Structure 1
Amino acid sequence: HHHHTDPEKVEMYIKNLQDDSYYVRRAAAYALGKIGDERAVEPLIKALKDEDAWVRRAAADALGQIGDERAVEPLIKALKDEDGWVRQSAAVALGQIGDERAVEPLIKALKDEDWFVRIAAAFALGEIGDERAVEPLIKALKDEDGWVRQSAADALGEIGGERVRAAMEKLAETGTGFARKVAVNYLETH
């Protein structure tokens, strides 16, 4: 059986976002993200401030699935959460929304202590496609983590433009290691 978007099911899960249990609050945020009904936006925003990190993570995730821009400013605040997975979730959600107000908080997240947050910030910057990210991404080509380094290289390919082209033309001669290979490959594929 396949189902229609059910308003009674969404109202149930909205109420469940204020449930005493954290497992119920978490499951509600995931079900609301899966339904993708915009009624869930303001209650999901309130859940980004939940006491439990699992619920905040789920609310950020669902808000990115829904893709509503009302969530931009609260997701910018969640990029500063104490929990690493909340920050990773908020970066992905901001990339999905694609609103340019997230560019500067995402450039800061490229310097996160967690490798998984840095990948998600690079990926979100590649999605937004804003040139302001170029020099911060070129710097992330020296990340200690290889997956962070590839994510920054993939995001540079996504942005393109004259700033990326001039930066890659230079880096193919001035760079070392992975960064130099990135620039050489960029020049052969463009």
Structure 2
Amino acid sequence: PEKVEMYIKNLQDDSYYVRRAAAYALGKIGDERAVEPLIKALKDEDAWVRRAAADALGQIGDERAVEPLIKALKDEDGWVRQSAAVALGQIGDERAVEPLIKALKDEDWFVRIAAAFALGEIGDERAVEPLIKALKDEDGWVRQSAADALGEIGGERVRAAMEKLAETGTGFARKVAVNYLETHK
């Protein structure tokens, strides 16, 4: 906690590693003063810095990072987008829901996982139908995370969809739905 301004100041250092390490440290410390300088490091030249900055903003958890993080979901770098999604998941703000639904169709499997995870944490039923679609994703971990997110959301929209999948679905989606029906009253 004593080193918060030293690390804020290191977000301007010429060395990418010093900037990255500063963002990482500021996420762990959790002091709110770091929020605006981290928002700025979401446009850093170096992708590792942008990743660490998103990560740190999620850890601090201040809603002021929501709109900048939503933008960072369009970053050229896959791991930045992944970090932004996890961070929006951690903050829990419903404004991320539609942008994260889009990121469920991201070309990188690791981004789609993070998008599903985050939708599950936010808990908003608009995500239900897009998560049912992700049950057919070519990546196994994506499918799985969409199933977990469906369970976390819950409620009557999830129940009704799981009845239909248990009835006519195939493959993984079927197994998900049947587990659902066995494990709820």
* TM-score category of the 2 structures, normalised to the smaller one: over 0.9
Q: Distance in 2 between matches of 1:111 and 1:59?
A: 24
Q: Distance in 2 between matches of 1:139 and 1:78?
A: 24
User: What is aligned with 2:41?
Assistant: 47
Q: Distance in 2 between matches of 1:159 and 1:12?
A: 41
Structure 2 counterpart SS, 1:155: helix
Q: Distance in 2 between matches of 1:62 and 1:152?
A: 25
CA RMSD of aligned residues (A): 0.7
User: What is aligned with 1:3?
Assistant: none
Could you tell which deviates more after superposition, 8-17 or 89-98?
A: 8-17
Q: Distance in 2 between matches of 1:170 and 1:23?
A: 51
Q: CA offsets, 1:123-181, max 9 Å, x none?
A: 00000000000000000000000100000000000000111000000110110000011
Residue 152 of structure 2 is aligned to residue 158 of structure 1: yes
State the TM-score, normalizing by the size of structure 1. 0.96
Q: Distance in 2 between matches of 1:165 and 1:58?
A: 38
**Share of identical aligned residues, percent?**
100
Runs of 4 or more above 4 Å deviation: none
Q: Distance in 1 between matches of 2:62 and 2:37?
A: 13
Q: Distance in 2 between matches of 1:27 and 1:158?
A: 33
Structure 2 counterpart SS, 1:18: coil
Q: Distance in 1 between matches of 2:112 and 2:60?
A: 23
Structure 1 counterpart SS, 2:44: coil
Q: Distance in 2 between matches of 1:19 and 1:189?
A: 53
State the TM-score, normalizing by the size of structure 2. 0.98
User: What is aligned with 1:64?
Assistant: 58
Q: CA offsets, 1:14-49, max 9 Å, x none?
A: 000011110000000000001000100000000000
Q: CA offsets, 1:34-90, max 9 Å, x none?
A: 100010000000000001001000000100111110000000000000000000000
User: What is aligned with 2:178?
Assistant: 184
Q: Distance in 1 between matches of 2:2 and 2:154?
A: 46
Equivalenced residues, count: 184
Q: Distance in 1 between matches of 2:135 and 2:55?
A: 27
Q: Distance in 1 between matches of 2:25 and 2:69?
A: 19
Q: Distance in 2 between matches of 1:122 and 1:163?
A: 17
Q: Distance in 1 between matches of 2:168 and 2:41?
A: 47
Select the residue among 27, 41, 59 that pairs with 1:33: 27
Structure 1 counterpart SS, 2:2: helix
Q: Distance in 1 between matches of 2:155 and 2:61?
A: 26
Deviation of 1:8 (Å): 4.4
